[PDB]
Design an enzyme around this catalytic site. Sequence first.
Site, PDB file in Angstrom:
ATOM      1  N   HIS A 183     -59.121 -28.611 -54.176  1.00  0.00           N
ATOM      2  CA  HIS A 183     -60.169 -29.632 -54.164  1.00  0.00           C
ATOM      3  C   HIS A 183     -61.192 -29.556 -53.006  1.00  0.00           C
ATOM      4  CE1 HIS A 183     -60.581 -33.609 -56.604  1.00  0.00           C
ATOM      5  NE2 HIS A 183     -61.650 -32.833 -56.728  1.00  0.00           N
ATOM      6  N   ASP A 231     -58.051 -38.710 -59.375  1.00  0.00           N
ATOM      7  CA  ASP A 231     -57.092 -38.125 -58.469  1.00  0.00           C
ATOM      8  C   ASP A 231     -56.092 -39.200 -58.072  1.00  0.00           C
ATOM      9  OD1 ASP A 231     -56.173 -36.516 -56.146  1.00  0.00           O
ATOM     10  OD2 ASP A 231     -58.264 -35.969 -55.705  1.00  0.00           O
ATOM     11  N   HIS A 247     -55.208 -39.049 -55.056  1.00  0.00           N
ATOM     12  CA  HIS A 247     -55.682 -39.045 -53.663  1.00  0.00           C
ATOM     13  C   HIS A 247     -57.180 -39.286 -53.484  1.00  0.00           C
ATOM     14  CE1 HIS A 247     -52.239 -36.351 -54.280  1.00  0.00           C
ATOM     15  NE2 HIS A 247     -51.687 -37.173 -53.390  1.00  0.00           N
ATOM     16  N   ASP A 292     -58.859 -37.992 -50.703  1.00  0.00           N
ATOM     17  CA  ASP A 292     -59.384 -36.711 -50.169  1.00  0.00           C
ATOM     18  C   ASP A 292     -60.542 -36.985 -49.186  1.00  0.00           C
ATOM     19  OD1 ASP A 292     -57.559 -35.717 -52.071  1.00  0.00           O
ATOM     20  OD2 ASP A 292     -59.081 -34.636 -53.260  1.00  0.00           O
ATOM     21  N   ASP A 314     -59.009 -33.978 -60.455  1.00  0.00           N
ATOM     22  CA  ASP A 314     -57.833 -33.389 -59.824  1.00  0.00           C
ATOM     23  C   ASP A 314     -56.697 -33.664 -60.783  1.00  0.00           C
ATOM     24  OD1 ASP A 314     -55.532 -32.773 -58.356  1.00  0.00           O
ATOM     25  OD2 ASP A 314     -56.374 -33.555 -56.469  1.00  0.00           O
ATOM     26  N   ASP A 345     -53.676 -33.805 -60.497  1.00  0.00           N
ATOM     27  CA  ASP A 345     -52.602 -34.653 -59.982  1.00  0.00           C
ATOM     28  C   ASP A 345     -52.925 -36.148 -60.162  1.00  0.00           C
ATOM     29  OD1 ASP A 345     -53.936 -35.628 -57.640  1.00  0.00           O
ATOM     30  OD2 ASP A 345     -53.120 -34.053 -56.361  1.00  0.00           O
TER      31      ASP A 345
END
Lengths: 317, 317, 317
Positions: free
Chosen positions: C99, C122, C124, C126, C230, C232
């Site tokens: 990412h 995501d 997250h 980031d 992302d 995830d």
Amino acid sequence: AKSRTIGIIGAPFSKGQPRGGVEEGPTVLRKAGLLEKLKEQECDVKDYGDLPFADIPNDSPFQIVKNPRSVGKASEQLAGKVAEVKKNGRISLVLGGDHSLAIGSISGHARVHPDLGVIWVDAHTDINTPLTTTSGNLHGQPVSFLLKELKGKIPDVPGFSWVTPCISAKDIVYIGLRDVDPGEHYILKTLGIKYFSMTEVDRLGIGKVMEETLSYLLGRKKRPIHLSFDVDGLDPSFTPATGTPVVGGLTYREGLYITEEIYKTGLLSGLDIMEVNPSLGKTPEEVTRTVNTAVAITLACFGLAREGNHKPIDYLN
Amino acid sequence: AKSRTIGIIGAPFSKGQPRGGVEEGPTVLRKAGLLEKLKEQECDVKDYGDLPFADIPNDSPFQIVKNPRSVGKASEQLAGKVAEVKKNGRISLVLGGDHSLAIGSISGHARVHPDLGVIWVDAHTDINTPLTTTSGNLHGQPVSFLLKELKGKIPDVPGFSWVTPCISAKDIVYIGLRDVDPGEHYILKTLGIKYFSMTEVDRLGIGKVMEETLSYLLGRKKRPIHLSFDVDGLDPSFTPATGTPVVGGLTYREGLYITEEIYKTGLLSGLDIMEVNPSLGKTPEEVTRTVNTAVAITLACFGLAREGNHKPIDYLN
Amino acid sequence: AKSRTIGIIGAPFSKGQPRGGVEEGPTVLRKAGLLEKLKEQECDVKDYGDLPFADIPNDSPFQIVKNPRSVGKASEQLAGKVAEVKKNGRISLVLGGDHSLAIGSISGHARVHPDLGVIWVDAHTDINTPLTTTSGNLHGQPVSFLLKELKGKIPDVPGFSWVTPCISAKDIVYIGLRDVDPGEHYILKTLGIKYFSMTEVDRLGIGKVMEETLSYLLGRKKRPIHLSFDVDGLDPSFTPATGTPVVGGLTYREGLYITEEIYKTGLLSGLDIMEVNPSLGKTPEEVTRTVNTAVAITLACFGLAREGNHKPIDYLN
Ligand SMILES: O=C(O)[C@H]1NC[C@@H]2SC[C@@]21CCC[B-](O)(O)O
Ligand SMILES: O=C(O)[C@H]1NC[C@@H]2SC[C@@]21CCC[B-](O)(O)O
Ligand SMILES: O=C(O)[C@H]1NC[C@@H]2SC[C@@]21CCC[B-](O)(O)O
Ligand SMILES: [Mn+2]
Ligand SMILES: [Mn+2]
Ligand SMILES: [Mn+2]
Ligand SMILES: [Mn+2]
Ligand SMILES: [Mn+2]
Ligand SMILES: [Mn+2]
């Protein structure tokens, strides 16, 4: 009670699709104790047995359409049997068998109740015609044979001369759609059929989906409900032993919610439990999981509720 | 802070049900690092240790009700310990052990806070009386002993003479119900207890469920909250190592949402983490999964939020 | 059509994180037939190939920040390539790769479309800065380099002198958050960034989440959308072959719903499919599951709908 008075019909048929084993669907659902479980739920259950589907040798294809006479005859017989069950004041419960049998199930139900509304729980629209299909499998075509708006689009297929379209495009609601063919999407949009694909289920939630479905069918006035349940409507994590599994399906909870809401109307008159294929489990546990889910769905159609149930007696005395 | 000031009570008790291993629940939750994880989350943690439940030999059944003196005494001792924790200005955190211990946990909590409201997260109501019960397992009966409206319906069970019903039917909310006995369903409906079975969770969504639960209990005025969490309330795909797993349960996300919303009120005063049985995993991974989910639920009760958490300091300097 | 006119960019880069294999992301997504599947979906696809990321020896860390020149150069090259694709009137489709590449993807996209809005899917945020990070892995810091409000908080990191923050805090919406560092949570709250953590997704439902996301970004007037996906962001039960999997993620259905809704605006101008690591599957099936999910997400961004799709022709004739 009317909502708990049932007529069981076994339909061990598979020639509506190419995968062997779906004819064992009534056997495995009976072995799981479906009849006994329904009786324990205060249901008046009469078993009409398993229909004998005499083999039709030399059943040559109509263009690309496979086993037309076999599929046509099985549905013709089922129609007669469902009509008999309906005349006896019972909710017909068809144990499938491939989804082509819905031609017979709905046709037979419509003979006694022409004002019926259909709720079609499936990953698929099953609305291909003998001319739009690319597979020739009639389990992906039962809706096209039943719709009045598609009269003139269905050619004269051997074994189907008895069929008279009994439902209008406005009398059917789809729930759980996620694997629709281009031809089927065109039909679905041009006929203006009401549907809740997985996209609408995600957007609205199953609560709003059921509220909208029942309002759309019953809003004008109370009318009989025919629920045609293809086990592939539910996610393969719950019903893996099926011919055409599609990821991102309805959850076990959503399946139970749909059926609990239909029971609650007191208008269920017909039910199809289709496409259970016990030879398509990767493990024996996958088969038992599919069968157990299909049994749980069926029990909810006839009153089994997650909040609980009790007899009309004083339990505190 | 008050919402992060905790008193840990281990209650390694299993005689409220027939399956051995649930007494290892406090051991395995501690081994997973629950105490350390809570301290890392800005919690003031005091561990009151594991209660010694001295064996009661010759504990013959009361009718069909098993180990009544053992269950009665364990709850009587737990009540005393919870009351001690509550008097020390801490949120009591009971690590079970079977759910029969709720009798002692709620009774003890009610001694210091008689105006408490109960949130009961579980697949089951646990409201069978010693007379409606068919199993005779006291873990399926804690609620009957606690309700004021059931006074006169509870017989004189050996070991339970200390019990005075401390909660009214209007002071309890169930979340997650999906396996209710006939007698229990009758009690639930006749007493007008507020509940959100899996059916209501499917209909409304966990957002509306929590909004309704907290408004129903706290709308009149702010009052202490006792959360009694049976791990079988969550789906067996998250908490498989438990005595009575039931499919179609609350998701990991829904479990975290319930507990995040309760933390946010700042009114959690008592918490029970019940029915973790580390000897009931099919694999060692099923045990670690159950324990990890139970730890995650607990951390959310004491402030751990999915959006994140930060100390009141400048992180950019 | 503009919404189906694509420029493919392979970005096989892994030095934004410590786990080897994420550089094989473009290879495995191509092997799965992504290009061919897009062309079958009536897309005009031009493949700009896989970017060569020349090795940078002696790439010493900036404080705790690992491989800064390699990450800085890879993003600098990607920015140039994305800008080229955007100038050619195509939607840039970046196949990652870690990412940190979003620095280059969004910077390059903003050079041609400075009024773009970002949707960041995501687990997250980031958004760590080179000074708030504790791992020093640049794939957890790309948003910090992009935000105008964080100018003066980002130190002079080698390889990043080309970077000019191109997005304001009000031009980004996060979806799926469930693993946010304390410093990231502080930034998220102090800058007033719009987000839908798993808590808001549970509260509102994905329908309301999308309605709010698109209204927040497009309410004033239509503007280009950059979706930075992302893998995830989705639950590890769908995308297990990823570096930082977190339980309780977005479902396969929710992932498809987000992307179906974005396609429908007709405003998607940039897309990143990040963090697919085919060396992180426990079994080959876990890798194929992750790749198949990532392909399904991408196809929905470019028109593939669960209700079905059809060409503008008469299928009944
Ligand atoms: O026309 C066909 O043969 C195909 N059209 C769409 C689906 S994929 C296979 C399919 C039919 C599934 C039937 B049934 O839903 O009953 O299982
Ligand atoms: O009375 C009984 O024994 C039963 N009544 C319904 C459920 S199935 C077993 C059960 C008790 C659940 C306990 B507990 O919630 O604590 O795990
Ligand atoms: O800054 C870090 O290294 C960490 N901060 C929060 C998450 S746990 C690992 C993490 C980065 C995830 C990046 B990515 O989302 O791209 O997978
Ligand atoms: Mn079907
Ligand atoms: Mn189907
Ligand atoms: Mn329980
Ligand atoms: Mn319980
Ligand atoms: Mn990321
Ligand atoms: Mn991530």
